[PDB]
Design a protein around this ligand. Sequence first.
Ligand SMILES: CN1CCc2c(c3ccccc3n2Cc2ccc(C(=O)NO)cc2)C1
Ligand SMILES: [K+]
Ligand SMILES: [K+]
Ligand SMILES: [Zn+2]
Length: 634
Amino acid sequence: AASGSALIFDEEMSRYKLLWTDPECEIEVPERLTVSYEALRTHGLAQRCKAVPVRQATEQEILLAHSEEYLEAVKQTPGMNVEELMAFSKKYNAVYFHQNIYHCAKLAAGATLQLVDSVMKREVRNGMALVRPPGHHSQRSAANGFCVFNNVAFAALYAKKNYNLNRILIVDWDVHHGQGIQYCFEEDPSVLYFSWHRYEHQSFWPNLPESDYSSVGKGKGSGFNINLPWNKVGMTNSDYLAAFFHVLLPVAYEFDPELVIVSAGFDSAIGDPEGEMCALPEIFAHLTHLLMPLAAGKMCVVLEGGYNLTSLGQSVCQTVHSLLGDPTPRISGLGTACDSALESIQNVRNVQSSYWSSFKHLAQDIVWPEPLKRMPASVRTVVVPPPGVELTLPKNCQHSGDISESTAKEVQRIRDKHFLTDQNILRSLGNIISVLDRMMRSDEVCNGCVVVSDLSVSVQCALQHALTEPAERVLVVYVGDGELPVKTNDGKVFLVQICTKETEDKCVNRLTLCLREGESLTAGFMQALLGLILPVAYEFNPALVLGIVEETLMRVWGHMTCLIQGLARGRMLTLLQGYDKDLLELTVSALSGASISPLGPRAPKPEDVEMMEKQRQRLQERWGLLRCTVSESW
Ligand SMILES: CN1CCc2c(c3ccccc3n2Cc2ccc(C(=O)NO)cc2)C1
Ligand SMILES: [K+]
Ligand SMILES: [K+]
Ligand SMILES: [Zn+2]
């Protein structure tokens, strides 16, 4: 199974620039590339990436997306002087040409193709191409919006042709609409395009009626084009995450792509003079992480825009950090999306409900704090199997049954206070405390898994010891039907429970998911995970995640374990009751950052969707990130 992240970059793509006065275009500068690579170098990220050389896209490759007439016209620009270059530029909208830009456009496109080959040949897990010029506005026969050739559209056509892929997801999180990509694939159900973009009721460039939520694709492609217009500026982390939980991810996990390509424009970040949005660079760590379980992690990130040199470097590092598997930053202050965003979300969900049934509803001078440091743990995952069980661990895991004397005193302290004598339980309690101490009190260990015999005693000591680490908030995720010694009456704990017996939920610090039996159970769980569990978990913002499985589904445990590591900087402790060799290896693999096997194809039972929406109604006034409609004003 592949490992590593590719980083594709060449200084040659910084060797063209605007040659005449034009305040509109003067933000597209060589320094965008130099600042981003240097930021990656400064933070040690470029050094941990496999450098793959750029190459030129061939004529044949360019003709996958562009016409002979347009290519021939661009091919003449290297011979043009400044007067001729300006006249050629003015044949198009919002684009400038330079003696070297045709060369650089072939490099930008070839760089993308190199990234596609590195990932699809399993030479790396994923990667990023830092390229100029950007691509997503260019069209079959036109340059547009600083773009000459459509790098990302190339990548998907090339992956289709050379790897016979049937399903490709393109995520365009640039702040502008990538109309060139939309047009390229609008009739094509094999490529799913998602774009959010500043729109402001069509008053924002490119001013197109077909950038609205009502453009769903054409013909056999209907439903495979998803536009989310932002009709106000100032969108925040919460708006962006609401878009992912309630629009992009539900569709993406049902689509089940074989490759993911990101049109990664960071002009959607705070401080950008084009986007004027308010999302922090740290949000791109989570946008990346939330897509990484798709396609067994095969993700090709391609730079589009981003014009605030500072938010640019920081957002590039946060993305590469997540591609490398480094722990995600905690996102504080999350809540409801704003009314305009909720309107956009509700509108796209409604027009798309004919194609993704999951969307059906039943009738009625800028500054921000510098991002903290993200550092992979010395050893990522600690595993404590039952005594005398030696297993083959991934290279970033480790055993740890070695209870210290400090720990041993604490276990007796606890034993004599609250409980009796089973020296096996008492050893596991020493393991829980030692693992928790390494997880919280050091950057030495990220997360862990402990196999456990007596649940009630083990949960109590894990939870109670976690609180005094200190862990100000603890998310508990429990697969089982019991009642745990967990109190949710002070706001320090949120309890997620997936069980078989329907049990009424009172207060708003608990989410109980009772899903019916059958082959429908897998999709229902995923829909609950993306639509309920993650919105609450993210708003709750825990400092530790505590997973609990009773010996008495679980085709999704790897997906939950991966996605839930977006919380608490990836600090998750899982207690498995009883030894199950496969569930233990699955848990360890997801905790350790390995790729997740895709889920493939059966839609959820209407009783399950009713139960989940009943839970959203019950919880969304407390937890506003659950909302996917505008609230009714009294
Ligand atoms: C300011 N409005 C929005 C942008 C714009 C407009 C415009 C008008 C004339 C020339 C260039 C222009 N530009 C330049 C422009 C800036 C950024 C991007 C971009 O990042 N696309 O992903 C693409 C184009 C209109
Ligand atoms: K976009
Ligand atoms: K499409
Ligand atoms: Zn842009």
